[PDB]
Amino acid sequence: INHGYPIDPVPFTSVKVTDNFWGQRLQASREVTIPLAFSKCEETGRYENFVKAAHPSDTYKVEGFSFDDTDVYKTIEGASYSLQTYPDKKLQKYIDSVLVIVAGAQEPDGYLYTARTMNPKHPHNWAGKERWVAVENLSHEFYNLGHMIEGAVAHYQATGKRNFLDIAIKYADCVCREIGNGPQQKKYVPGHQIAEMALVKLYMATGDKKYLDQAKFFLDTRGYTSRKDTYSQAHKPVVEQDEAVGHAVRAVYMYSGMADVAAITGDSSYIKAIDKIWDNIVSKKIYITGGIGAHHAGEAFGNNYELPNLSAYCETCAAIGNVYMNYRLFLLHGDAKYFDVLERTLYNGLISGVSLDGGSFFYPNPLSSNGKYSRKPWFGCACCPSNVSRFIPSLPGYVYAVKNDQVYVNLYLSNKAELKVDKKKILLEQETGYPWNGDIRLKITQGNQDFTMKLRIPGWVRGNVLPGDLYSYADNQKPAYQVSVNGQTVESDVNDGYLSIARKWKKGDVVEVHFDMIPRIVKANPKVEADHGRVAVERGPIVYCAEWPDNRFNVHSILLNQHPQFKVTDKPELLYGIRQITTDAQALSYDKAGKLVTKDVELTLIPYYAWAHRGEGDMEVWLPIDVSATSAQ
């Protein structure tokens, strides 16, 4: 059943990753992250909640969070993706055992929500006294449904079995029969959006239009209920929203649902709203790491241009949702600028949230540290680890896309892919050192077909830090790029951010691509007060930072040269293999006689994602280049 977007995804099952960067992240997800998250679901009581729901009792203290059941649904989602690329009888049998425990907690009419079922006389304090009554506050009853669906659909696609799917269908039918516009129903919308995107997905798996109508009901009714709160984007009808406000995850999950519903019903009204919201996010409310969410209070978007560094929120879940949103905008519009934003988030503020070994995570992802902040294996609220669990293995699904005769190449990494192009099979291989350098060989290894290959030419190689004027390059550098097909240079035009190559493609044909990767300094719009007198360091798609281990001085005390010169060096054995950046700078301090002293130092910079892997201490992304922004001790 067709999703309705004008461009088709190329699924993650079609793309075998052969590189070192992503390939190690994928291995780490399978060998450490998914096993750890299941192990934590046992250890922190997530399974016991379902067992308790199976034997209700007045005596249970219902504690944790009302959305804790989703940690289980999301880890099963991620495992289920893993199983499709890497079969594993034991993981698959383990999941069956978990699902028996999950199925036991479900009431006969399909309601599955352990925070009430465990102890209906004394339910979780966020659940309310009765079903649904606190849903637009913090019950998370429809959030739980959403993650349950996404988990179940994935498990069905991985196993051909319905032991998860049937549970989701039943809870979905419970919601659909009790919640709606009908006269024996109750008008309620999600307190935490996700059910909208998830119900489109369940429709696509089952053919039951009830689910699509429920998703549309959820969206269309928002803003017309008693709870008109900014926190959950219910301050206005969603079609009239034009700025990203409130809780960052809630926001991007709703914008993603708005996109899915729009595509599948051919309704452009939701699209005209998210186009404006996207413009607001990218021109006004996005960090240079691609993170979103400026305030601890509400885990929320700030005002326009409000981007503080130390107190930046940037929940890893929000980075993941930001990827979901931009991918969908790409599918609607066919412009690479959506993948520039997605690439920035993906390579920086998303992967910053999981350690390289896969065993610890971040909830918030700040752009500065004064120490006392490292990744943890889990949290009371485990939304980020379980989201990481589910995201990483799906990564190969983001690389390509196809519309008819048009093949989009959106990410650069070594991989072999099978593409369906006007109903003929095309095997395509990328070989590259990306993100570490800008050389890409693409080869047709099997098949022959006339088609147009669209190569994303990243914003960074064309002088655009991001779409819009939130940021600009503040050096003199003039990066260049070149493309060739079988030794003939393409000096065709960049349209919609792609260099487009139309020809008969055959086994043997080679595309060669070169992007200069030169260290850049980035300046923020002068309206961003936090970054006055400061610049950020970048190379290719990687944002850099200064961290304490590499620098025999206080990292918060540097003063970059007025016209900083940069050296890049390969470090294959440092932090899983990276390129570090070096620059000649000054470190400032106050001597014993009370005088400012400047000391010439070598400043060593690492990828932002690689910070915090070697001990708590100081870190800065936004480096002073003016004495107004310095700090001496």
Automatic annotation (TrEMBL):
Q: Which residues bind Zn(2+)?
A: 315, 317, 383-384
UniProt domain Non-reducing end beta-L-arabinofuranosidase-like GH127 C-terminal: residue ranges: 519-624
Under the heading InterPro entries, the entry gives:
6-hairpin_glycosidase_sf, Beta-AFase-like, Beta-AFase-like_GH127_C, Beta-AFase-like_GH127_cat, Beta-AFase-like_GH127_middle
Q: Which Pfam family is one of those matched by this entry?
A: Glyco_hydro127C
Q: Which GO terms describe its biological process?
A: carbohydrate metabolic process
Q: Where is each Non-reducing end beta-L-arabinofuranosidase-like GH127 catalytic domain found? A: 14-396
Name-wise, this protein is Six-hairpin glycosidase
**Keywords attached to this entry:** Glycosidase, Hydrolase, Metal-binding, Zinc
* UniProt-recorded Gene Ontology molecular function terms: hydrolase activity, acting on glycosyl bonds; metal ion binding
Domain (Non-reducing end beta-L-arabinofuranosidase-like GH127 middle) ranges: 406-517
Q: Which domain of life does this protein belong to?
A: Bacteria
User: What species does this protein belong to?
Assistant: Bacteroides thetaiotaomicron (strain ATCC 29148 / DSM 2079 / JCM 5827 / CCUG 10774 / NCTC 10582 / VPI-5482 / E50)
| Leader sequence segment | none
